[PDB]
Design a protein around this nucleic acid. Sequence first.
DNA 1: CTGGCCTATA
DNA 2: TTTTTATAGGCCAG
Lengths: 334, 333, 362, 365, 364
Amino acid sequence: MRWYPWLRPDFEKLVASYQAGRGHHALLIQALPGMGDDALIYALSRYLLCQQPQGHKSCGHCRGCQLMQAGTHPDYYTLAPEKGKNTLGVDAVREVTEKLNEHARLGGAKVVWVTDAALLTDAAANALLKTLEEPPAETWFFLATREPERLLATLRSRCRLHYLAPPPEQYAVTWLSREVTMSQDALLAALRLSAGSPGAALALFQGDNWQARETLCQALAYSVPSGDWYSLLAALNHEQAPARLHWLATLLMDALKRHHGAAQVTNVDVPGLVAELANHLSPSRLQAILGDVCHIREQLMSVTGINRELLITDLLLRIEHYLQPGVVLPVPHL
Amino acid sequence: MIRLYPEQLRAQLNEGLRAAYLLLGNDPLLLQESQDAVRQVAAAQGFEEHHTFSIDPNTDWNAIFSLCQAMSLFASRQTLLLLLPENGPNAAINEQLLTLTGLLHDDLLLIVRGNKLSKAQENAAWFTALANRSVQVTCQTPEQAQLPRWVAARAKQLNLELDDAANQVLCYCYEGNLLALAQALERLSLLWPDGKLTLPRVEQAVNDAAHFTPFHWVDALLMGKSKRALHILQQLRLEGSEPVILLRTLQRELLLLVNLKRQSAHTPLRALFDKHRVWQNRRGMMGEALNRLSQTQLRQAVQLLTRTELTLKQDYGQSVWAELEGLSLLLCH
Amino acid sequence: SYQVLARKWRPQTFADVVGQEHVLTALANGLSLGRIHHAYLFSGTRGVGKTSIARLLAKGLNCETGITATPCGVCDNCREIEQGRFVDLIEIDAASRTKVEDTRDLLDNVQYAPARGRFKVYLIDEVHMLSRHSFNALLKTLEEPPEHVKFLLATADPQKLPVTILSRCLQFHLKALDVEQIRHQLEHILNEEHIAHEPRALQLLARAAEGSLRDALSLTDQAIASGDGQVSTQAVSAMLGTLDDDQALSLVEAMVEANGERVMALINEAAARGIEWEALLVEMLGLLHRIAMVQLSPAALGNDMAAIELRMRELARTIPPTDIQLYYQTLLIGRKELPYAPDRRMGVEMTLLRALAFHPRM
Amino acid sequence: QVLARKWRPQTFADVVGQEHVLTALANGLSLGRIHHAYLFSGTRGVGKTSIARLLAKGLNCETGITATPCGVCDNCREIEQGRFVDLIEIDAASRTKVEDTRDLLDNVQYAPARGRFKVYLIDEVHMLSRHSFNALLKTLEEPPEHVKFLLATADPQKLPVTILSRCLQFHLKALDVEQIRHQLEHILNEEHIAHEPRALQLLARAAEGSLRDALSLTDQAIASGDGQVSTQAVSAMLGTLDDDQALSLVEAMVEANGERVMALINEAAARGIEWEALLVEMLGLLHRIAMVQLSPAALGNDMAAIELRMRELARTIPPTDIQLYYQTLLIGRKELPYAPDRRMGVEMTLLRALAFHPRMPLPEP
Amino acid sequence: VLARKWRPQTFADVVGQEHVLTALANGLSLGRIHHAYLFSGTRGVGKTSIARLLAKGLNCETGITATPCGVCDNCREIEQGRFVDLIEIDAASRTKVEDTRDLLDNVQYAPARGRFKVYLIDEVHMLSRHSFNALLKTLEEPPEHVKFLLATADPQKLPVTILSRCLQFHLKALDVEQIRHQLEHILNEEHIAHEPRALQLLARAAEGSLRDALSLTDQAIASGDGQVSTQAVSAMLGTLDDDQALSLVEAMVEANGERVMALINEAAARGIEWEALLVEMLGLLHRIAMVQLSPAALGNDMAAIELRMRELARTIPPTDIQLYYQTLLIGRKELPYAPDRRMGVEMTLLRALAFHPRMPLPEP
DNA sequence: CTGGCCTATA
DNA sequence: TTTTTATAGGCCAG
Ligand SMILES: Nc1ncnc2c1ncn2[C@@H]1O[C@H](COP(=O)(O)OP(=O)(O)O)[C@@H](O)[C@H]1O
Ligand SMILES: Nc1ncnc2c1ncn2[C@@H]1O[C@H](COP(=O)(O)OP(=O)(O)O)[C@@H](O)[C@H]1O
Ligand SMILES: Nc1ncnc2c1ncn2[C@@H]1O[C@H](COP(=O)(O)OP(=O)(O)O)[C@@H](O)[C@H]1O
Ligand code: BEF
Ligand code: BEF
Ligand code: BEF
Ligand SMILES: [Mg+2]
Ligand SMILES: [Mg+2]
Ligand SMILES: [Mg+2]
Ligand SMILES: [Zn+2]
Ligand SMILES: [Zn+2]
Ligand SMILES: [Zn+2]
Ligand SMILES: [Zn+2]
């Protein structure tokens, strides 16, 4: 969990309110992945739990800070998911909501960090509602998401919103150039793939990840001219599919942008693949395929347990059908 | 080690008893029947004390040290039974067994029930040094091919006279559930002392109760026999099979079909099967399929199997069984 | 002893409640007539007075002064309810205590008479989460409680309750609070709190409340931290994501002119200014609506548009009504499906791109 | 106090509808042919619990097993107050487990304390675990002479077939607009409460077949209208608007005249009427119209004041056209959540109507 | 009660089931008694009735016989309810192991009246794993004076390790005539008036169960005030119709709009959940479209609905069938938005009707 | 009253 | 060679 420089002022504004004792008991921070909301919170958590605060700072030498420092501090609850899983269940919430009525087991404040509100089960969300509207005293909640609009209506209105806007593109690229050594064009794409978030950007270069985009790009460079899109299975069928599908989505879109002669593309670093999409596919089909590729991505992410291989396979067999002349293409609904 | 089919057992247990009787297989009736044929003849050779013992990996190193002790001379002859885990003899139990292999008396008679064994499980020292001493009984069930003979065989041992056509009708109704086929004859001989089981006579005394695995279904699809399929579905329902399982087993195959069908333009049929490690007995069946089904039908099958996966796990839908009845028909044109 | 506005200002007497005047009336009305039911159910969207009112009805039943519709708030009994400490208002977090075993306990302790109050009032909130079995356990008792017992159910999502449960209740559907309703209330509060505000920023806040007082109060408390102490127009608008009127129209224009290169290039400067995408889409839906309207009668364009009106009327004259509906339609669906696409930006891009390639008919 | 509870019929005479159930029972008590497992089913509020209790009351009446219990003998009055030591009203939804059912069984053998019969009435019986169902099986097929089972439930399909085959099933039907109305009147009269005759038609309808839903609705009508059940009160509470203004906008729409459509919306707007509400009454009308086309007598009994005009519309407009207006007004609904502004959305929906109007489209450039 | 009174006390008295009875007869007759019988089949087709006869014929004072006498002390004693050596366990209320262990501790002591100790375990599917294990031990080593008659409607639940120790007799469902005849018999003996077709309607409604039949009659006899009339029975069965969805498919294809909108009204009384009617219809349409690809697509399941279905299949155009289908699915997609769920289903059929290919809707 | 096991609903 | 998941209700042996 790292701390990024673009947090300083967001932190300094949020602590302030707390420092006055007028902090809001239920802050929902919205940040892209990799924007460092987890560290922004930690900072806020640590400050709330330290018994000898040096202004904004946590001292390190008080009992509180020590315990916090060593995993175990009785009054800090983390609500992430069970290790094997990707939802955050109701039973897990209910422990935290109960123990919260016990006087602070070290007579301080109690802080609850909900790592990603998106992961609250529908049942977990509601269970959180009454405690969240009116917690005991000196209780402090922190939740985070990508997208507040995906969050239970009633949960949303008990929180105060704080927006973690990402730094200017320029700043972020200069940030990056100092962490990885890649082409300028590269950074820029990685960054743009990542909706602006440096570090979410940076994370692309760290994994097996960028090596795998190059593989998607290679494969794609073949399917386009030839019409073999089932050929993509191998580069897409992988646990990281939602991400790689999103990569493919942005390529289709960049091509659609060139059919319109737009200045920004996203995949700045592969303007050759972008052009070949523009050349061998009609607007009508670039667009339709963009449609389906996103729509599956959603399902792949939002349907518990759904079979990746079957879904990606059907998507590829079906794209090939769209390629045929005169087939009827998909048009969003409702 | 004298390998046997349950029918043959009765005779080679009369010749000579042997220190070890290995009952291996899957079929619930061939096991019970064999089991009992042995216990019966053991009492009758002086055996009073009979002990049973199910071996989980749960049996401690104190539960297997109360079995090795369970055989000391001279006690009136005792019949020690052992039951087996799903996996068979693990590395922990592969060794406990080794301890029993040399403790063999005319006083202690070993009986062992369970599934078939992995080939290097069978070839694990203790088992082959039991080998010239032991008898082994194949209890696998007969399949849609091998089955009628087993019926016309049992039919005769119960001295009943079955017709070509009545045989056909028992095999349809009771496939994969011998224990019901067996009572089927028992019930028919009480019905008619004649012993003559004309078709129409046997017809009236039957009920439909086959047991299939999801594999049976995909096979019927692969070979384009639709009426068979639909029967399999209807029975798979009433046994309450998780339909999720059906989806996934149809898919391993339907996706493989997609992928063969494509490449089959470029590389010969045979090289492809090799490429993919396609079990030999499956291979003729597969080609049949690849021949009847277009590269489009396959695609429609894939789209339609996908709609029913979503319909199941996203929409929490009822449809599923009927969506599969229909998928099943599509793959048979 | 600080607490968020959203919490402090919970109406503590009927007199202090905003709107919902049809509920407040039948409640006060029945309390007075003597026609007091045993199972009131309270519904509506988040933050419009559901459980604030339940709690008010409970003070009203138990008040030391008498069963009233206008409860004092100055007897041991109203104070205790205010603070949650009152023994004979049993408040259940249904969303937490959903299990039958739990609600069967509830029942086993109904037969017993009230401690210090006149009625034993069960307030089951977020009631839509009780299990199926829990709902049915209540069936017999909810229909036929002891004379000393009253049930007050509240939920945001009443669709989810079995129809057998509804049959047995009086259902009061609280309306969403009106834009002005929310606004006057915002004014009052910021005044009593002694905080500086600018009229037009209350305007933006009420709109953005999207019908809900709590929502509204939470936005306000966000204004007050973001704003350094003031709730100014400048501040709220930066925070909310509000648009300067030109940028929206320019996009509508480039959109109908099938001008790809410009729609994208124009979204890109929007991206840089940090615009709230759902706002864009909405403002855009709004202009398309004017336009289609004017085409009906020329006088339907507002005084409010003056600086735009030249560009509006053109779009009205040029573009066929039919083709404007497809534009509206397409951006509406696009807003709906917005939070599902991989970025918010990418969603606006797929949406406008789709719309772009309409222009020529045949 | 509370209507829904006060008016529970206390004799068969007092029960509304359900002739087919009432007749059968009565025909059978005097006929001396009396089952041991009666099962009562049908939607909420149609009289199953109250019939069940009436049967019990009739089975034990000190005068004799009779279809017309006397409502005065100790047993009758006692059953009415719910404190009769031989009518065991079992709340199946709390006693759901087997170990519970087993206790009920253990005490079946024992003979009644005061009456001809020990009557178990097992209400909301569909909640019993699978286990406790089968536990009932044998005792339900072959009880003792002095035992009777009255099962009642909202949904019977939940009951194992093995249970059903064992009992007489009386499925009470939901109630006619007219049947409910008559009752709502009787009660309001007897209870001395001023009412407008139409407020009753309006409630009887909103009741959606349920007599309880009806009374519950009336109760809060009495409260909303302050001691009076008035049409203004009722349609306020129901979100109906009084029927002219809805229809008038439909007509304006089919007649393609925009000015009036928009005007009628501006007028809807000063009243503040609820936007989804309006869209709904309109589909609500567009339907009855498509309906009346099909079968003529099908036009409702509630809209006498509007029929002249409705009839006219069914006459003059092609079904294919009407399915269009409904379609269009429907997705309008689907869209309303997402439209910028709930009004704007309703406005825009009708504009779509005019732009795609079949008989006089909006003017192309 | 009819269901109780007319319980066969003699083998002759039993309806159908001839393939069980005959084997039982001959086994008693020819000295072949298994140590354990299991009787299965659906609700009310003779499962336990036959169990209780095997007991009479097993202990008759005349001897072991196919033709028990029903008059000896032992035979009226069992007919009655209290025969010292017929232990009829209600295995559903006594399922725990404690209870089964205690039953079986007395298995060893001899029978104090007749030839055999007969344990008659009914609705036996309910016993625990552990109560089965315990039962098994005694069925593997049956005492001689002991026999075990096991009955359950759902045998699929007994362990394979028990099914393998009982001769299992699967009772058949009774045929419409088989049921009709017994109806006529009984109704006459009780001296009760009936029209030929009232009985044909009852038997059909019973769905193959002789109990569901007698239960349906007792009630019939009430609605008729002592007479079983077609006027009357037809009435009562319409009270109880599952019908509504299959019926609307038939009445939709035939363009009969009064019958279509009256069925929609019939549905409202029975008190339907509307999105559910729709779904039974889409689901019927599907099932039919497949009995167009093969006959085998109609289930073991379908029987009472069945005759109707095969005819619906023959007499329809399969391009038409996917036509209706598109319209119903859309009505569904539309139904939460339609103003009244009822109105929704109505306008969905009204749409189905005006866009009828075969006989369209009249235009002004 | 725990831990093993089964089931139904969404 | 045989499989979605989160929450719930429930039965049983010892
Ligand atoms: N009608 C209203 N009048 C005044 N304040 C209100 C009203 N509705 C909501 N609020 C504000 O919203 C906060 C939460 O309200 P609450 O009554 O819990 O809404 P809910 O219906 O969602 O339970 C209250 O504390 C109060 O500040
Ligand atoms: N047939 C009916 N006749 C008169 N009142 C009825 C009838 N059905 C329902 N009610 C009214 O609704 C109340 C609740 O009825 P109840 O019989 O409990 O319905 P349920 O069938 O759902 O148990 C009754 O007390 C009565 O006032
Ligand atoms: N074959 C049959 N002959 C005559 N009556 C029957 C027959 N089957 C069922 N019945 C009727 O149903 C009643 C109960 O039958 P039963 O044998 O207990 O059904 P189950 O198989 O469900 O235990 C009997 O009293 C009898 O009246
Ligand atoms: F937040 Be409220 F109870 F909808
Ligand atoms: F109100 Be009823 F018993 F469903
Ligand atoms: F007694 Be049966 F199985 F209904
Ligand atoms: Mg609330
Ligand atoms: Mg009731
Ligand atoms: Mg039985
Ligand atoms: Zn510190
Ligand atoms: Zn007071
Ligand atoms: Zn009386
Ligand atoms: Zn006799």
